[PDB]
């Protein structure tokens, strides 16, 4: 049971060894490019030695006994809601890209799956959906205005209202004439030739 | 220890190479098994003691 | 290794209280800090000499 | 035959789900049953698993939509609502049960794993995300180990 | 020597001179030093049984293998000869240039 270290006297069973991160500041060199996610730390603490040294000595547990260790870990992070690493800042949505009359006076409506980006960091649900709509508006601004795409025919629009609330089966329309402004659940509004993709995007869960 | 050296206008390091003993014993009992027993005495590090 | 500031002349160092069994001897030299990269690291951000 | 056949409406989450984050101590703890020692970060043996310390919390403003209009006027800009009048494209009302992400501190327990007979001076601690990609968002980490005897090897 | 800082063709520019640039060679080290990672606990070589688990290479942070090879190599045989297989050509200065 003799768990022994070189300089000090041989300790007996059930001691403690600590893996902390500021010890990283100490053998700085070793982890010049590492983060708290993965790092090299000095377990050995003796106070005699300067912080840099004493990191080469090894703790030995006697070979005759098969040693096992308990473990308790402490973790506390800060991850934003929208970020590049967690596949939340990007999403693909096919939209109308150009509306130009042809020689036969027949209008031609092109389409293109264009990837979008969101400033990382915006957080709340409302704001997020709103931002996403912002990006769409943006694509139209960059290209529709240019190729002459009317703002009426924006393929993709996000909303949370229940459009059939005022629906009346007797007539087939909405008698109040305005959709009720009460949010229910994130949903997507599409137009012919447009759509949404989430193959390599995670905001799916947010839209629910 | 106390060293005394001539001045220079740029940072310098002094490298003392404490000489020591440092050996490895290679133990290979079965096919495809290697066990090493390190040792470095004046600056203790390794397995045996 | 031990740092020596610019225009320094005296270099006191201390080796704290170890066992000195089977110790063999010493060997020492002086090096320029520019030309000695910080080994052990994958990449040295400041090393600018070759 | 509609969309309901292959889609499920779930409650929205700011966190967009949660990923289990694994723990790796390649130089101290003996590897698990089926893993093999390797120096790839991605594959470092998994000696512990716990949920990511990020969860949603529920907050309720019911006056929400009103709140939103307040929000817009205070904003000083129409921006988000660029086509005010058309009903279809108007700014969607804020949900009354909106949720906010939060970074709860985590302090987990992992029972016991066999560790190497000779621990080392520079042990390496590694936390990996789901796909074994190191997570850049971890502010502190700390490991506590209590070695104890388990069995002997001398008959 | 650049006579006049004015640009474009001019008589002063006709009066200029030249000088060859300094020599500067580039190659690998004496024994491919630094190509293989040594004495770096972050990036350490591993050699064990495929089957087993414990590595048989333990590399401390403060040991220096490079220098050692460089010495042994000096001890076992001459270094003045050049072996092109591992670039084995020890660096040396011209003794009539080090001292004047």
Curated annotation (Swiss-Prot), chain A:
Tell me the compartments it is located in. Answer: Virion; Host nucleus
Please give the positions of the paired cysteines in each disulfide bond.
Answer: none
Keyword Nucleotide-binding among record annotations: no
Spell out the molecular function terms from Gene Ontology: structural molecule activity
This protein's domain notes: The cell attachment RGD motif is exposed at the virion surface and is involved in binding to the integrin heterodimer ITGAV-ITGB5.
Its function?
Answer: Major capsid protein that self-associates to form penton base pentamers, each in the shape of a pentagon, situated at the 12 vertices of the pseudo T=25 capsid. Involved in virus secondary attachment to host cell after initial attachment by the fiber protein. Binds host integrin heterodimer ITGAV-ITGB5 (alphaV-beta5) thereby triggering clathrin-mediated endocytosis of virions. Mediates initial virus attachment to CXADR-negative cells. Binding to integrins ITGAV-ITGB5 also seems to induce macropinocytosis uptake of the virus.
Q: Which family does it belong to?
A: Belongs to the adenoviridae penton family.
**Name of the protein:** Penton protein
What is the phylogenetic placement of the source species in the record? Viruses, Varidnaviria, Bamfordvirae, Preplasmiviricota, Tectiliviricetes
Curated annotation (Swiss-Prot), chain B:
Q: Which gene encodes it?
A: L3
Per the record, the domain of life is Viruses
Coiled coil location: none
Reported function = Major capsid protein that self-associates to form 240 hexon trimers, each in the shape of a hexagon, building most of the pseudo T=25 capsid. Assembled into trimeric units with the help of the chaperone shutoff protein. Transported by pre-protein VI to the nucleus where it associates with other structural proteins to form an empty capsid. Might be involved, through its interaction with host dyneins, in the intracellular microtubule-dependent transport of incoming viral capsid to the nucleus.
User: What name appears for this protein in its UniProt entry?
Assistant: Hexon protein
Query: What does the record say about induction?
Result: Expressed in the late phase of the viral replicative cycle.
Q: Which residues carry this modification: Phosphotyrosine?
A: 38
Additional comment: All late proteins expressed from the major late promoter are produced by alternative splicing and alternative polyadenylation of the same gene giving rise to non-overlapping ORFs. A leader sequence is present in the N-terminus of all these mRNAs and is recognized by the viral shutoff protein to provide expression although conventional translation via ribosome scanning from the cap has been shut off in the host cell.
User: From what organism does this protein derive?
Assistant: Human adenovirus C serotype 5 (HAdV-5)
Describe the family membership recorded for this protein in Swiss-Prot or TrEMBL.
Answer: Belongs to the adenoviridae hexon protein family.
Localization per Swiss-Prot or TrEMBL: Virion; Host nucleus
From Swiss-Prot, chain C:
Where is it located?
A: Virion; Host nucleus
Tell what triggers its expression.
Expressed in the late phase of the viral replicative cycle.
Show the stretches that span the lipid bilayer: none
Q: Which domain of life is it from?
A: Viruses
What additional remark is attached to this entry? All late proteins expressed from the major late promoter are produced by alternative splicing and alternative polyadenylation of the same gene giving rise to non-overlapping ORFs. A leader sequence is present in the N-terminus of all these mRNAs and is recognized by the viral shutoff protein to provide expression although conventional translation via ribosome scanning from the cap has been shut off in the host cell.
What family does the database annotate?
Belongs to the adenoviridae hexon protein family.
**Protein function:** Major capsid protein that self-associates to form 240 hexon trimers, each in the shape of a hexagon, building most of the pseudo T=25 capsid. Assembled into trimeric units with the help of the chaperone shutoff protein. Transported by pre-protein VI to the nucleus where it associates with other structural proteins to form an empty capsid. Might be involved, through its interaction with host dyneins, in the intracellular microtubule-dependent transport of incoming viral capsid to the nucleus.
Q: What is this protein called?
A: Hexon protein
Query: What gene is this protein translated from?
Result: L3
Swiss-Prot record, chain E:
Lineage, opening ranks = Viruses, Varidnaviria, Bamfordvirae, Preplasmiviricota, Tectiliviricetes
Relate the induction remark in this record.
Answer: Expressed in the late phase of the viral replicative cycle.
Where located? Virion; Host nucleus
Give the free-text miscellaneous remark of the entry. All late proteins expressed from the major late promoter are produced by alternative splicing and alternative polyadenylation of the same gene giving rise to non-overlapping ORFs. A leader sequence is present in the N-terminus of all these mRNAs and is recognized by the viral shutoff protein to provide expression although conventional translation via ribosome scanning from the cap has been shut off in the host cell.
Protein role: Major capsid protein that self-associates to form 240 hexon trimers, each in the shape of a hexagon, building most of the pseudo T=25 capsid. Assembled into trimeric units with the help of the chaperone shutoff protein. Transported by pre-protein VI to the nucleus where it associates with other structural proteins to form an empty capsid. Might be involved, through its interaction with host dyneins, in the intracellular microtubule-dependent transport of incoming viral capsid to the nucleus.
What's the encoding gene here? Answer: L3
The protein's name is Hexon protein
- Give the superkingdom in one word: Viruses
Disulphide linkage map: none
> Hey, which family's this protein in?
Belongs to the adenoviridae hexon protein family.
């Amino acid at each position: 049971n003799s768990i022994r270290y070189s300089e000090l006297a041989p300790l007996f069973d059930t001691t403690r060894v600590y893996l902390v991160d500021n010890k990283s500041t100490d053998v700085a060199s070793l982890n010049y490019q590492n983060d708290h996610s993965n790092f090299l730390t000095t377990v050995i603490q003796n106070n005699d030695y300067s912080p840099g040294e004493a990191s080469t000595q090894t703790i030995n547990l006697d070979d005759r006994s098969h040693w096992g260790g308990d473990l308790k870990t402490i973790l506390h992070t800060n991850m934003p809601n929208v970020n590049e690493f967690m596949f939340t800042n990007k999403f693909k949505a096919r939209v109308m890209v150009s509306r130009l009359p042809t020689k036969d006076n027949q209008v031609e409506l092109k389409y293109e799956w264009v990837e979008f980006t969101l400033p990382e960091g915006n957080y709340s649900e409302t704001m997020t959906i709103d931002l996403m709509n912002n990006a769409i508006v943006e694509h139209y601004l960059k290209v529709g205005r240019q190729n002459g795409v009317l703002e009426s025919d924006i393929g993709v629009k996000f909303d949370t209202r229940n459009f059939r609330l005022g629906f009346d089966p007797v007539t087939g329309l909405v008698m109040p004439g305005v959709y009720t402004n009460e949010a229910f659940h994130p949903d997507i509004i599409l137009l012919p030739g447009c759509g949404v993709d989430f193959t390599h995007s995670r905001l799916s869960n947010l839209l629910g | 220890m106390t060293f005394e050296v001539d001045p220079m206008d740029e940072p310098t390091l002094l490298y003392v190479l404490f000489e020591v003993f440092d050996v490895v014993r290679v133990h290979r009992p079965h096919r495809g098994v290697i066990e090493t027993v390190y040792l470095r005495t004046p600056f203790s590090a390794g397995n045996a003691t | 290794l031990y740092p020596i500031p610019a225009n320094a002349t005296n270099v006191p160092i201390s080796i704290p209280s170890r066992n000195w069994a089977a110790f063999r001897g010493w060997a020492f030299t002086r090096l320029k800090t520019k030309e000695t990269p910080s080994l052990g690291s994958g990449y040295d951000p400041y090393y600018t000499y070759s | 035959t509609g969309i309901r056949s292959w889609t499920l409406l779930c409650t929205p989450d700011v966190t967009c789900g949660s990923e289990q984050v694994y723990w790796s101590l390649p130089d101290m703890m003996q590897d698990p049953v089926t893993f093999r020692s390797t120096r790839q970060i991605s594959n470092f043996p998994v000696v512990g698993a716990e949920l990511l310390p990020v969860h949603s919390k529920s907050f309720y403003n019911d006056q929400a939509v009103y709140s939103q209009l307040i929000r817009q006027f205070t904003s000083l800009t129409h921006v988000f609502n660029r086509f005010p009048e058309n009903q279809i494209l108007a700014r969607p009302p804020a949900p009354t049960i909106t949720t906010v992400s939060e970074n709860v501190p985590a302090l987990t327990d992992h029972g016991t794993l066999p560790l190497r007979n000779s621990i080392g001076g520079v042990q390496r601690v590694t936390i990996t995300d789901a796909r074994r990609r190191t997570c850049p968002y971890v502010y502190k980490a700390l490991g506590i180990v209590s070695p104890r005897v388990l069995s002997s090897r001398t008959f | 020597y650049m006579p006049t800082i004015k640009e474009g063709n001019s008589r002063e520019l006709m009066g200029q001179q030249s000088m060859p640039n300094r020599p500067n060679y580039i190659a690998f080290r004496d024994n491919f030093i630094g190509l293989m990672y040594y004495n770096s606990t972050g990036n350490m070589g591993v050699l064990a049984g495929q089957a087993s688990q414990l590595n048989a290479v333990v590399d401390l942070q403060d040991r220096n293998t490079e220098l050692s090879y460089q010495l042994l190599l000096d001890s076992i045989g001459d270094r003045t000869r050049y072996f092109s297989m591992w670039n084995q050509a020890v660096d040396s200065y011209d003794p009539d240039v080090r001292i004047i």
